[PDB]
Amino acid sequence: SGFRKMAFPSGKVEGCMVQVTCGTTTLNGLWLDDVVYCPRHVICTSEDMLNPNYEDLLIRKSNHNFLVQAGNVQLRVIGHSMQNCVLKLKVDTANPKTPKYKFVRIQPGQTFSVLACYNGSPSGVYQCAMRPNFTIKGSFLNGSCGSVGFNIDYDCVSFCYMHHMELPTGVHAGTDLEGNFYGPFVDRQTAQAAGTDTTITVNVLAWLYAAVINGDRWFLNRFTTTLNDFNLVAMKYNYEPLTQDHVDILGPLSAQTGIAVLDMCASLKELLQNGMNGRTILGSALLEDEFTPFDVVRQCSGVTF
Amino acid sequence: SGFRKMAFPSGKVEGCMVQVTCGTTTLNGLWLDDVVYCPRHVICTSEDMLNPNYEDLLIRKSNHNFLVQAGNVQLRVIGHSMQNCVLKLKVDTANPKTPKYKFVRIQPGQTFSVLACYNGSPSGVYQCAMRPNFTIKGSFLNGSCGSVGFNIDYDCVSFCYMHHMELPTGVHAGTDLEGNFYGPFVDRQTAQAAGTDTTITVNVLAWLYAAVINGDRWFLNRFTTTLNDFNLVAMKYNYEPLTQDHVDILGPLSAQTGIAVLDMCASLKELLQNGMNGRTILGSALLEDEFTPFDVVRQCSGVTFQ
Ligand SMILES: CNC(=O)C1(N2C[C@]3(CCN(c4cncc5ccccc45)C3=O)c3cc(Cl)ccc3C2=O)CC1
Ligand SMILES: CNC(=O)C1(N2C[C@]3(CCN(c4cncc5ccccc45)C3=O)c3cc(Cl)ccc3C2=O)CC1
Ligand SMILES: [Cl-]
């Protein structure tokens, strides 16, 4: 019993974190095989950040301008190139701790673990979701750029996020490991803002199933609804639309608990229209949306890595 | 910016997790140097759990009755002994991944990371706090016994908890790494229950300071309180008494934000009276109590967003 915001074990990722320094800028890099990946803004001064020409800034750098430190060992940079908003530094040593990995681009609503890092050293691990507005509600300070997000499947690490910046509302923006931003953001210090966000409906339903599995059933009722009527109510409360794919994905949970997905949608409609009336669900007074259906099944089954 | 329930990176602990089996019973063990530590109830069948005589059960076992598996390698047990509610199995190989470590017994209110494990394999990591009633609100299934709790301040792992059982309310009980239970619990299937729990006042105050550091002050008020009048109110809401030690511990957060501890206590008294009126503090609609003053200093910026 119990239900916690749980991250994947971070060990396989800790063995890949290094420190990258270019002049006065020090940030984190990810060392896989003989390449270190890091945000391309490592080559920028504060003035360059106002309107950078990354190719022009990069041509003025030699391999020796990049100082890469893995623990207490200096790695020799033997090549450099840019891929979108990521800098790839070829080093003369393959990381002996390189795990089995893939680079994957995730969709809004998907969750992942973040290994927050400073000066190439891991400081903490926490669970995040890619918001519908393509930001993440992380916990990051200056020096955290280059920290990565990931999931694990069996023995394979799927890297999905690299940290680049913090927006004025204190939320975070970054790229996939191919340097493509999530959201309409750019790696420049120009006026940028998080758009209006929405709640991830399929995840709230998954968390209501987790509550039922754990014994919280007060919110259940005799009613059901249709997908169309439910989506009219979701649009009204700034919830994302629920699709037939989301209904199908929740199938196993509907079968285990005996509560149909549209039966749980009727519980969610009543919760939106009435509130909790002083009650809590899994120790929360808000409807939680950062657990996917897969996260709920995994935590309630004890899958190991 | 931001404020999350943040665990320590689990790598140093993952490299210590092993599987321990005695007959049909299997659970997790912690392998440090040449010793594997695990709950002593690995020597019990379900039929032994009501009134187990651990000394009588253990004397009937040889070293070779204990099967220890580290990854896909079988370790050889060359000695065994019981210390309180833990079993210590001496093995013929020192763990090459043993980190720098210490065993620390913590007090209620303290937080730690848990590496949930099954069959010697890590499944996830999360933050926990030792409740005032000496239980932890973990997330554990059958097979999780032997999973540990720890902190990693300054590169040394401080192991503080080893998981033993789940109480009828779904909360968890366990021991320090010397096998001494936290709370009045025993490793028996006899009727046991968590006592009435309370909210960790010093941690709620630390989290209110985290919110001020992160740029929010909506909950503050023009009032102050004496420590005794604050305790008289807080106890009516089932909050733990705030001591002068807790006031002293909050000194650094008070200095960083410019809000005296007793002035933050007045804010907390008002929040307990009024609720949040549709507002949230650090993304929560409830007053959070599983962040210590030390955790706030660890995670938050050293510069308040004024
Ligand atoms: C809040 N940011 C800032 O004050 C500044 N900034 C800096 C930066 C790099 C570091 N960084 C941060 C990343 N995560 C957390 C943070 C916390 C507190 C300060 C910074 C942080 C950035 O955002 C950056 C990167 C890119 Cl690709 C584009 C623009 C910026 C940027 O605007 C200084 C001006
Ligand atoms: C909830 N517990 C149980 O149903 C039973 N039980 C078993 C056990 C060992 C495993 N275990 C669990 C530990 N964490 C999570 C769990 C989740 C779900 C089942 C069990 C779990 C225990 O509690 C145990 C150990 C000790 Cl030292 C003392 C008593 C017990 C005990 O009562 C079976 C009867
Ligand atoms: Cl302590």
UniProtKB/Swiss-Prot annotation, chain B:
Cleaves the C-terminus of replicase polyprotein at 11 sites. Recognizes substrates containing the core sequence [ILMVF]-Q-|-[SGACN]. Cleaves and inactivates human TRMT1, preventing tRNA guanine(26)-dimethylation of tRNAs. May cleave human NLRP1 in lung epithelial cells, thereby activating the NLRP1 inflammasome pathway. May cleave human GSDMD, triggering alternative GSDME-mediated epithelial cell death upon activation of the NLRP1 inflammasome, which may enhance the release interleukins 1B, 6, 16 and 18. Also able to bind an ADP-ribose-1''-phosphate (ADRP). It comes from the Viruses. There is a cross-link at residues 5, 90 (Glycyl lysine isopeptide (Lys-Gly) (interchain with G-Cter in ubiquitin)). This is 3C-like proteinase nsp5. It catalyses: TSAVLQ-|-SGFRK-NH2 and SGVTFQ-|-GKFKK the two peptides corresponding to the two self-cleavage sites of the SARS 3C-like proteinase are the two most reactive peptide substrates. The enzyme exhibits a strong preference for substrates containing Gln at P1 position and Leu at P2 position. Residues 1-306 form the Peptidase C30 domain. Residues 1-306 are cytoplasmic. The active site is at residues 41, 145. Changing residue 189 to A: Does not affect ability to cleave and inactivate human TRMT1. Inhibited by pyridone-containing alpha-ketoamides compounds 13a and 13b. In turn, alpha-ketoamide 13b (tert-butyl (1-((S)-1-(((S)-4-(benzylamino)-3,4-dioxo-1-((S)-2-oxopyrrolidin-3-yl)butan-2-yl)amino)-3-cyclopropyl-1-oxopropan-2-yl)-2-oxo-1,2-dihydropyridin-3-yl)carbamate) inhibits SARS-CoV-2 replication in human lung cells. Inhibited ex vivo by michael acceptor inhibitor N3. Inhibited ex vivo by compound 11a and 11b. 3CL-PRO exists as monomer and homodimer. Only the homodimer shows catalytic activity. Interacts with host FBXO22; this interaction promotes the proteasomal degradation of nsp5. The lineage of its organism: Viruses, Riboviria, Orthornavirae, Pisuviricota, Pisoniviricetes. It is found in: Host cytoplasm; Host Golgi apparatus; Host nucleus. The gene is rep.
